[PDB]
Each structure stands twice: as structure tokens, then as C-alpha cells.
Amino acid sequence: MRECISIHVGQAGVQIGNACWELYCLEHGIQPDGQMPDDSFNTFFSETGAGKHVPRAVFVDLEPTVIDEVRTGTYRQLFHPEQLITGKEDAANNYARGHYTIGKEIIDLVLDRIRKLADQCTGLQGFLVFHSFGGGTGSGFTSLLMERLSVDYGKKSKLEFSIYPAPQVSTAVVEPYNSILTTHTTLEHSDCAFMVDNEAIYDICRRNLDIERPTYTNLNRLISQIVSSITASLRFDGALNVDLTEFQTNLVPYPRIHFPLATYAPVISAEKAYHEQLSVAEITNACFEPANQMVKCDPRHGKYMACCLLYRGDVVPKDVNAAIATIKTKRSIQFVDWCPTGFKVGINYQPPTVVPGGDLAKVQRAVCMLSNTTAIAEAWARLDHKFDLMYAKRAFVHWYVGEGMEEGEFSEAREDMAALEKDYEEVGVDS
């Protein structure tokens, strides 16, 4: 019944996967061994003959290090060994190595494992793909896998949770190249993609959680909370829900304009105890503050095409509508002329769950706003400009060419990005 398969690619994807699955277990009362003493959780967890609950997920990395930590870790019994796939040689922050050279060896094995999970599904909805834009595996292997998934799965829904690179935490000079190459190749294969800018997450951890030097552990716990908010509607049956198809129908007006901006609230530090309880009005107001965004950009300089508000916990429809009405009186929120109905609201009964010993405080109510704004084009522009700086001099190009890539693939990828930026511009013009 309505199953969803989660694929975690590369270090970023695997590490975010660890955070997501830890949070899902806390939310559904599943122990780290898969034991549990609704029924919708079955969309994400299958059940074995021993009454154990197993994530409907595949973890893939071209290097074994990251995944070796999962198979030694607290949740080693949660996953069956066959769903934790590792190679020997990494993609060395090279899209060409991930996509071609190294990727081509493991691709068939990864798809065989995905096929085995799909065979356990009676009503497979589709896939959730987690990866970084910057790493060779996250970029190169993901686009290779996405292409192969379109072939094997027909017209099956594929949603992404993409880690947009940040210099505060960046590991490679070539991340703009890998980002553009993966976006070009994956664009025609993805139905909806939620970008997560590591700088936005880094700044929220610093500002809201008072963490001087945020680590991936800090970043992922926060990321996991947003992913859980998007997936709560699939894993639970509330008063107001949204399936794989309804997300896309409400937020995606055109094929290529499939990049919603996520905004989450409240993000409160586990200290204090006075900084709560926030009302529905207060958390809704926080969604329109650029400081709570998952991608750095300015919506006041762009136009909205769709706004989805996903509430969780002690929330009443009357409270929500009152909050939306006051926000509508703040003229500053501009929508495209071809869009009337701006607000689609969903309420899921379960209050946000937090990891014990975590940085996040337990709240009675939270909200995740998914908005399709033309302001997200600003994130593409930043990436495209960094690509252009290096590409004008063909700096580092030899690394890709050496692996069998052609220079033409770089031109093609960049022209496609130029067309994407042009698409966001065309969409914001009035008729």
C-alpha cells in the first residue's frame, strides 16, 4: 500500500539518511533493532516474519567509510546488509568518475537491490533521492542512477533532497562544475526537487541553536526535521494529508520549474525553557522571514506561484486561517498573475519529535512552508557564475576530459542552466 523507496547517495545523502531514519524510528516508536511494542508508517517500513520493521531504503557510496559507520553503528540491526552498498574507490570529487568510470561498475548491483525492494511493494508511489551536488558520488552517481530509474520504472514519481554546496563546509574547488553537471543530467528525470543550502542550515544552527562551529551532525538533525515534515503526510494519516502526486500537482506548474523553497519554524535551542510556547500566528509569521529559509535567496524580489503550509502538532484550522489572513494584509507577498489560490494547508496531528541529547527543543507545534518562488533562480545564478569563472579558463576541465567526458557536455550543461534561469524569468512576467 502506497510505498516510498528512499535512496541515499554519497556521504551527504548517507549521513542525512542516518538522521532521517533515526527520527522516523522515534516518531513511529521503532527501536534500533526494528522492534516496536496509525498503520501509515508501512509506506516507509516493511515488516518481516519476526515482526521487525525494516526501512524501505538503499544506501549507496563509492567509498566504504561512511556506510561502514552505519553497519557498525546503533542502527546496524535496523537495515539488512544487502541494502547498504559500497564500492572501493570514491569518485574523488569528480562527476565524470561518479557517472562513468567508477559508477558503471556498481550501477547494475544498486538497481538489482532497488528491484528487490520494489518487488516487496504492492503500490509503489516512487522514489526519494538524497544526495549532495558537490561530491563526485553525490553528483555523478545520482544522475547515472536517475537515468537508469526512468528506464526501469516508467512513469514512477522521483523526488530529490539535494544538498546545495556552501563554502563554510565545502570540500572541493570543483563543486560548481559537479553541481551544474548533475542538475543538467537529472532535470528531465526528476519530478520535484527540494534544495537544502548548507549555508542557510549553517546560519540557522549558529543563530537559532547557538552552535559556534556547526558540524554535519548539527546540520543533519535540522535537515531531518524538514524531511520529516514533508514525509509526515505519507507516514501518518491526519485530518489534512498530501501524497507523492498532490505535492507535485500543487507546487509544480511547469515541468522544469520543480524547485520549491522550504522554510521551517520554530527552531529553538534545547536550553532556555521560556522561549516557548509559540502560537500558530508566531510560527506562520516565521515562515516569511528569510532567516528561516533552507536556501539563501530573497522572495520579496521574486514572485510566488504556489504556497503549501504543513503544520504539525497542536494546530486548529481556525488558528491557521486567522494567521494567513493577517499575513495577506502585509501587501509585500506577491504572486504571479496566472495564480489565484495561493495557500494549500495541511495539518498532521503529531508534534515534532526531537533526538534525545540533540540541540533542538521539544515544541507543541511546528510548520514547514514549501513555496514555489522565482527567487530560487538566485541560487542557480550564484552556482552558474562560479562555473563561468573557472570554465572561461577551462580550469580543472582536464580532470573530467581524462575520465572520458567531452567539453561539449560542459557547454550543454551550462546552456541548459541558462535556459532554466530564463524559464524562471519568463514565468514571473505578467501576460
Binding site: 526512468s150 528506464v151 516508467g154 512513469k155
Partner: protein
């Protein structure tokens, strides 16, 4: 007199329902056509 009034009637109701199904059957021939097209374009997509 009546024969060539009720026969001329039975003909004028068979027609007003012939023109019905005939013109609301191509309303299934077209729903087959764009429906074949529905997975045809989806297939030749995977051809690329």
C-alpha cells in the same frame, strides 16, 4: 393515413437516436485514440 404517419414517426425517432449513438460512439473512438497516444509517447520517450 395513420400507417404513413407512425412509420414516418418510427423513422424520425430511430434517426434522432441513430445520430445519437453514432455521434456518441466516435466519442469513444477518440477516447481510445488519445489513450493509445497516452502510453505511445511515453514509450518512444524511453526509445531515446
Amino acid at each position: 393515413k395513420l400507417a404513413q404517419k407512425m412509420e414516418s414517426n418510427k423513422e424520425n425517432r430511430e434517426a434522432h437516436f441513430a445520430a445519437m449513438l453514432e455521434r456518441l460512439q466516435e466519442k469513444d473512438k477518440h477516447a481510445e485514440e488519445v489513450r493509445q497516444r497516452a502510453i505511445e509517447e511515453n514509450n518512444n520517450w524511453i526509445k531515446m
